[PDB]
């Protein structure tokens, strides 16, 4: 399985004929798009999430195939995750970028994602709203009017989209324990459909795979959709 590339002519054709419907794409040269992967595997009061190492390498290989430079932050606290996100939102390469990806994977609760020192009595949680506050058009200007794809896995803001999986830790991993079900299905659909589908359409393909009578409960959800146009990643261009 590999990331199928979109033909150059279709990338040029779709850019001309559907320019007003799709997000703009910067040229390969002079392009410095960035991506950030935050993943907590070791905890003090939570079960170990070892096996997400394959989700890190999988997402990192996929984003690199999408011409993204991936920064990996691992086993951080709630405050350290806050500081890493704002440092990412202020990097100058976003000015020469067209989009960004934020992949956050750890244990979680409804209001946010847990950190390495989370306890049910002393919670250490990064709230989901903090992520949008950091990258909104007010506090992040180099990514204004640009797609800000957020992919979360747990247990005015514009141009946002969030693919969220809250599958509990017991039933969230593949039978091999070599990666999670959600990430593996996400990578598979990106490798098979990035070249002919826009981003939100790819997220729907991932959801359709969870449309079995057994997997419907673990179905990922698209939340806080603030995007104003379609995002074709045009893999290979």
Curated annotation (Swiss-Prot):
The modification (Microbial infection) ADP-riboxanated arginine is found at residue 174. It is found in: Cytoplasm, Cytosol; Endoplasmic reticulum membrane; Mitochondrion; Inflammasome. GO terms for biological process: apoptotic process; cellular response to amyloid-beta; defense response to bacterium; defense response to Gram-positive bacterium; innate immune response; intrinsic apoptotic signaling pathway; intrinsic apoptotic signaling pathway in response to endoplasmic reticulum stress; non-canonical inflammasome complex assembly. It is an enzyme of class 3 (hydrolase). The keyword Oxidoreductase does not apply. Widely expressed, including in keratinocytes and colonic and small intestinal epithelial cells (at protein level). Not detected in brain. The keyword Disulfide bond does not apply. It comes from the Eukaryota. In response to activation signals, undergoes autoproteolytic cleavage and activation. It catalyses: Strict requirement for Asp at the P1 position. It has a preferred cleavage sequence of Tyr-Val-Ala-Asp-|- but also cleaves at Asp-Glu-Val-Asp-|-. Keywords: Acetylation, Cytoplasm, Endoplasmic reticulum, Hydrolase, Immunity, Inflammasome, Inflammatory response, Innate immunity, Membrane, Mitochondrion, Necrosis, Phosphoprotein, Protease, Secreted, Thiol protease, Zymogen. It is a peripheral membrane protein. Induction: In peripheral blood mononuclear cells and purified monocytes, up-regulated by bacterial lipopolysaccharides (LPS) and interferon-beta/IFNB1 at the mRNA level. However, this increase is not observed at the protein level, which remains constant in monocytes and other cell types following LPS treatment. In monocyte-derived macrophages, some up-regulation at the protein level is observed following treatment with LPS and IFNB1. In SH-EP1 neuroblastoma cell line, up-regulated by NF-kappa-B RELA/p65 at both mRNA and protein levels. Its EC number is 3.4.22.57. GO terms for cellular component: cytoplasm; cytosol; endoplasmic reticulum; endoplasmic reticulum membrane; extracellular region; mitochondrion; NLRP1 inflammasome complex; non-canonical inflammasome complex. Belongs to the peptidase C14A family. Inflammatory caspase that acts as the effector of the non-canonical inflammasome by mediating lipopolysaccharide (LPS)-induced pyroptosis. Also indirectly activates the NLRP3 and NLRP6 inflammasomes. Acts as a thiol protease that cleaves a tetrapeptide after an Asp residue at position P1: catalyzes cleavage of CGAS, GSDMD and IL18. Effector of the non-canonical inflammasome independently of NLRP3 inflammasome and CASP1: the non-canonical inflammasome promotes pyroptosis through GSDMD cleavage without involving secretion of cytokine IL1B. (Microbial infection) In response to the Td92 surface protein of the periodontal pathogen T.denticola, activated by cathepsin CTSG which leads to production and secretion of IL1A and pyroptosis of gingival fibroblasts. Heterotetramer that consists of two anti-parallel arranged heterodimers, each one formed by a 20 kDa (Caspase-4 subunit p20) and a 10 kDa (Caspase-4 subunit p10) subunit. Upon direct LPS-binding, forms large homooligomers, resulting in its activation. These oligomers are often referred to as 'non-canonical inflammasomes'. In its precursor form, interacts with TMEM214; this interaction is required for association with the endoplasmic reticulum membrane. Interacts with CASP1. Interacts with NOD2. Interacts with SERPINB1; this interaction regulates CASP4 activity. This is Caspase-4. It comes from Homo sapiens (Human). The gene is CASP4. The chain holds residues 104 to 377 of 377 of the full protein.
């Amino acid at each position: 399985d590999a990331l199928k590339l979109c033909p150059h002519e279709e990338f040029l054709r779709l850019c001309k004929e559907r320019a007003e419907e799709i997000y703009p794409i910067k040229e390969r040269n002079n392009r410095t798009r960035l991506a950030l992967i935050i993943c907590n595997t070791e905890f003090d009061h939570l079960p170990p999430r070892n096996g997400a190492d394959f989700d890190i390498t999988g997402m990192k290989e996929l984003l690199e195939g999408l011409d993204y430079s991936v920064d990996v932050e691992e086993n951080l606290t709630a405050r350290d995750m806050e500081s890493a996100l704002r440092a990412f939102a202020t990097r100058p390469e976003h000015k020469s970028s067209d989009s960004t990806f934020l992949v956050l994977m750890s244990h979680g609760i409804l209001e946010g994602i847990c950190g390495t020192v989370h306890d049910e009595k002393k919670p250490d949680v990064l709230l989901y709203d903090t992520i949008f506050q950091i990258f909104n058009n007010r506090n992040c200007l180099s990514l204004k009017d640009k797609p800000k794809v957020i992919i979360v896995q747990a247990a005015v803001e514009k141009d946002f989209i969030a693919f969220c999986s809250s599958t509990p830790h017991n039933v969230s991993w593949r039978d091999s324990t070599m990666g999670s079900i959600f990430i593996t299905q996400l990578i598979t659909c990106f490798q098979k459909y990035s070249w002919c589908c826009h981003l939100e359409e790819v997220f729907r393909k991932v959801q359709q795979s969870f449309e079995t009578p057994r997997a419907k409960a673990q179905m990922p959800t698209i939340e806080r959709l603030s995007m104003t146009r379609y995002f074709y990643l045009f893999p290979g261009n």
